[PDB]
Amino acid sequence: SGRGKGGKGLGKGGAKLRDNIQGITKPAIRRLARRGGVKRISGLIY
DNA sequence: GACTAGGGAGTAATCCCCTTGGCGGTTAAAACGCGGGGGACAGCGCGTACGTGCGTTTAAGCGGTGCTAGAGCTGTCTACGACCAATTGAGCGGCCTCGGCACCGGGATTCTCCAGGG
């Protein structure tokens, strides 16, 4: 029992991305534009 | 006075409902790409409507005046508003409906495109 080694001692207890990116999207902006009453838009608005 | 009997708290075991993570399935929204066409914009011409020079006058600033009715401060009082609580009802805290809202279908109605002739 005392002599030898083996895993029967449980453990002591150790320890064992928060950057985030902006959302929104082109279809959402397009829907918002259509709410604002625009017939045609260019490609630099978003 | 010595020991006895019973029940809610102290200790403890049961249940068991409640969630922490990960992972797969599946629909919806987002992502990407092409033909073609309508919107953007150059080149230009012009005319006519202002941009500008000069004559000929009314008018704001000028220079001053003689006051005149409305504005600031001096008392002064007195009608009224911010100081306790009993109240007691105007109204809010929690629950239980059935009805208007949610939303989709059949249809009438209506809005739009084309390839031709008319």
mmCIF file of all heavy atoms in Angstrom, chain B residues 71-75:
data_model
loop_
_atom_site.group_PDB
_atom_site.id
_atom_site.type_symbol
_atom_site.label_atom_id
_atom_site.label_comp_id
_atom_site.label_asym_id
_atom_site.label_seq_id
_atom_site.Cartn_x
_atom_site.Cartn_y
_atom_site.Cartn_z
ATOM 1 P P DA B 71 -43.160 101.174 -18.452
ATOM 2 O OP1 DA B 71 -42.842 100.163 -19.482
ATOM 3 O OP2 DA B 71 -44.318 100.973 -17.552
ATOM 4 O "O5'" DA B 71 -41.863 101.397 -17.541
ATOM 5 C "C5'" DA B 71 -40.554 101.310 -18.110
ATOM 6 C "C4'" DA B 71 -39.483 101.607 -17.070
ATOM 7 O "O4'" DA B 71 -39.665 102.955 -16.570
ATOM 8 C "C3'" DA B 71 -39.501 100.711 -15.833
ATOM 9 O "O3'" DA B 71 -38.191 100.602 -15.292
ATOM 10 C "C2'" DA B 71 -40.409 101.482 -14.892
ATOM 11 C "C1'" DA B 71 -39.985 102.911 -15.193
ATOM 12 N N9 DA B 71 -41.029 103.883 -14.928
ATOM 13 C C8 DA B 71 -42.310 103.871 -15.401
ATOM 14 N N7 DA B 71 -43.035 104.882 -14.984
ATOM 15 C C5 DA B 71 -42.167 105.598 -14.177
ATOM 16 C C6 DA B 71 -42.318 106.785 -13.435
ATOM 17 N N6 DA B 71 -43.458 107.482 -13.380
ATOM 18 N N1 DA B 71 -41.245 107.228 -12.744
ATOM 19 C C2 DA B 71 -40.105 106.533 -12.810
ATOM 20 N N3 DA B 71 -39.848 105.407 -13.463
ATOM 21 C C4 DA B 71 -40.927 104.993 -14.138
ATOM 22 P P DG B 72 -37.764 99.294 -14.464
ATOM 23 O OP1 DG B 72 -36.681 98.640 -15.228
ATOM 24 O OP2 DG B 72 -38.996 98.541 -14.136
ATOM 25 O "O5'" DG B 72 -37.165 99.872 -13.094
ATOM 26 C "C5'" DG B 72 -35.907 100.546 -13.088
ATOM 27 C "C4'" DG B 72 -35.614 101.149 -11.721
ATOM 28 O "O4'" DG B 72 -36.441 102.326 -11.517
ATOM 29 C "C3'" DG B 72 -35.887 100.230 -10.534
ATOM 30 O "O3'" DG B 72 -34.881 100.395 -9.545
ATOM 31 C "C2'" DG B 72 -37.248 100.707 -10.032
ATOM 32 C "C1'" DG B 72 -37.178 102.196 -10.317
ATOM 33 N N9 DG B 72 -38.486 102.800 -10.530
ATOM 34 C C8 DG B 72 -39.484 102.324 -11.343
ATOM 35 N N7 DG B 72 -40.547 103.076 -11.358
ATOM 36 C C5 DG B 72 -40.235 104.122 -10.502
ATOM 37 C C6 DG B 72 -41.006 105.242 -10.120
ATOM 38 O O6 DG B 72 -42.146 105.550 -10.481
ATOM 39 N N1 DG B 72 -40.321 106.060 -9.236
ATOM 40 C C2 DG B 72 -39.049 105.835 -8.772
ATOM 41 N N2 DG B 72 -38.568 106.747 -7.913
ATOM 42 N N3 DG B 72 -38.310 104.783 -9.114
ATOM 43 C C4 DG B 72 -38.967 103.970 -9.983
ATOM 44 P P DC B 73 -34.750 99.335 -8.345
ATOM 45 O OP1 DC B 73 -33.346 98.876 -8.303
ATOM 46 O OP2 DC B 73 -35.840 98.344 -8.496
ATOM 47 O "O5'" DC B 73 -35.060 100.199 -7.035
ATOM 48 C "C5'" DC B 73 -34.268 101.339 -6.734
ATOM 49 C "C4'" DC B 73 -34.973 102.233 -5.729
ATOM 50 O "O4'" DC B 73 -36.162 102.805 -6.334
ATOM 51 C "C3'" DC B 73 -35.438 101.530 -4.453
ATOM 52 O "O3'" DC B 73 -35.176 102.353 -3.326
ATOM 53 C "C2'" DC B 73 -36.937 101.355 -4.680
ATOM 54 C "C1'" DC B 73 -37.269 102.600 -5.485
ATOM 55 N N1 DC B 73 -38.489 102.457 -6.326
ATOM 56 C C2 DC B 73 -39.375 103.532 -6.448
ATOM 57 O O2 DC B 73 -39.126 104.589 -5.855
ATOM 58 N N3 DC B 73 -40.481 103.386 -7.218
ATOM 59 C C4 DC B 73 -40.713 102.231 -7.842
ATOM 60 N N4 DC B 73 -41.817 102.134 -8.590
ATOM 61 C C5 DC B 73 -39.824 101.124 -7.727
ATOM 62 C C6 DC B 73 -38.735 101.279 -6.966
ATOM 63 P P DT B 74 -34.835 101.690 -1.903
ATOM 64 O OP1 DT B 74 -33.441 102.048 -1.565
ATOM 65 O OP2 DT B 74 -35.237 100.268 -1.958
ATOM 66 O "O5'" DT B 74 -35.821 102.440 -0.892
ATOM 67 C "C5'" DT B 74 -35.793 103.858 -0.793
ATOM 68 C "C4'" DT B 74 -37.096 104.378 -0.220
ATOM 69 O "O4'" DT B 74 -38.074 104.491 -1.275
ATOM 70 C "C3'" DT B 74 -37.736 103.474 0.816
ATOM 71 O "O3'" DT B 74 -37.212 103.772 2.107
ATOM 72 C "C2'" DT B 74 -39.221 103.831 0.708
ATOM 73 C "C1'" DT B 74 -39.372 104.261 -0.757
ATOM 74 N N1 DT B 74 -40.058 103.252 -1.629
ATOM 75 C C2 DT B 74 -41.239 103.591 -2.248
ATOM 76 O O2 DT B 74 -41.769 104.681 -2.123
ATOM 77 N N3 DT B 74 -41.781 102.605 -3.032
ATOM 78 C C4 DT B 74 -41.267 101.338 -3.251
ATOM 79 O O4 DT B 74 -41.822 100.518 -3.973
ATOM 80 C C5 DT B 74 -40.026 101.048 -2.572
ATOM 81 C C7 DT B 74 -39.377 99.705 -2.731
ATOM 82 C C6 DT B 74 -39.486 102.008 -1.805
ATOM 83 P P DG B 75 -37.608 102.864 3.371
ATOM 84 O OP1 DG B 75 -36.590 103.084 4.421
ATOM 85 O OP2 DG B 75 -37.874 101.494 2.881
ATOM 86 O "O5'" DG B 75 -38.992 103.490 3.861
ATOM 87 C "C5'" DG B 75 -39.900 102.707 4.617
ATOM 88 C "C4'" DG B 75 -41.276 103.343 4.616
ATOM 89 O "O4'" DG B 75 -41.767 103.436 3.252
ATOM 90 C "C3'" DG B 75 -42.339 102.576 5.386
ATOM 91 O "O3'" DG B 75 -43.281 103.485 5.934
ATOM 92 C "C2'" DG B 75 -42.964 101.704 4.303
ATOM 93 C "C1'" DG B 75 -42.925 102.637 3.100
ATOM 94 N N9 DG B 75 -42.835 101.939 1.820
ATOM 95 C C8 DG B 75 -41.702 101.419 1.243
ATOM 96 N N7 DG B 75 -41.919 100.853 0.088
ATOM 97 C C5 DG B 75 -43.285 101.007 -0.114
ATOM 98 C C6 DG B 75 -44.098 100.593 -1.195
ATOM 99 O O6 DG B 75 -43.770 99.985 -2.216
ATOM 100 N N1 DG B 75 -45.428 100.946 -1.005
ATOM 101 C C2 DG B 75 -45.918 101.613 0.089
ATOM 102 N N2 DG B 75 -47.235 101.863 0.087
ATOM 103 N N3 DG B 75 -45.169 102.009 1.113
ATOM 104 C C4 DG B 75 -43.865 101.672 0.942
#
